Ligand binder design. Sequence first.
Ligand SMILES: Cc1cn([C@H]2C[C@H](OP(=O)(O)O)[C@@H](COP(=O)(O)O)O2)c(=O)[nH]c1=O
Ligand SMILES: [Ca+2]
Length: 135
Amino acid sequence: LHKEPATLIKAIDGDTCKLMYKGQPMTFRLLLVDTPETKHPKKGVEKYGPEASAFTKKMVENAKKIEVEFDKGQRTDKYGRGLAYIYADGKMVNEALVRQGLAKVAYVYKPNNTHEQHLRKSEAQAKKEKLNIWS
Ligand SMILES: Cc1cn([C@H]2C[C@H](OP(=O)(O)O)[C@@H](COP(=O)(O)O)O2)c(=O)[nH]c1=O
Ligand SMILES: [Ca+2]
């Protein structure tokens, strides 16, 4: 895969944010994970939703560097959102959330699953430590 610089525009929730990419603002959705809902009335404000939002927000706002890393399949979803692994100062936000028990590994659609095993391994650790979503 290949990392590319991006610039934080606005953090939306635990797994969605707006970034300035290649000169254009665009909204991104983290690959292979799912943080709890805080918007959509169908899901309502799910537990740990606000926690995941705060974790992500903090991590991306205090970063000196943000990088996007597309996987090997499609780069956008049906809503026009960019699909990527996002790094804040070299740390993958996707993994950071899973490791804390603030997200579950989800929407694993190949071939966009290069980091699936790494992420699951962290989810297992968060799980055995009964962290947040797993408590
Ligand atoms: C992470 C991800 C989300 N999605 C879709 C699945 C869900 O569609 P539906 O809206 O049809 O359920 C939605 C989940 O994202 P949210 O967690 O932002 O809802 O985005 C993908 O198609 N590919 C992906 O890789
Ligand atoms: Ca979410």
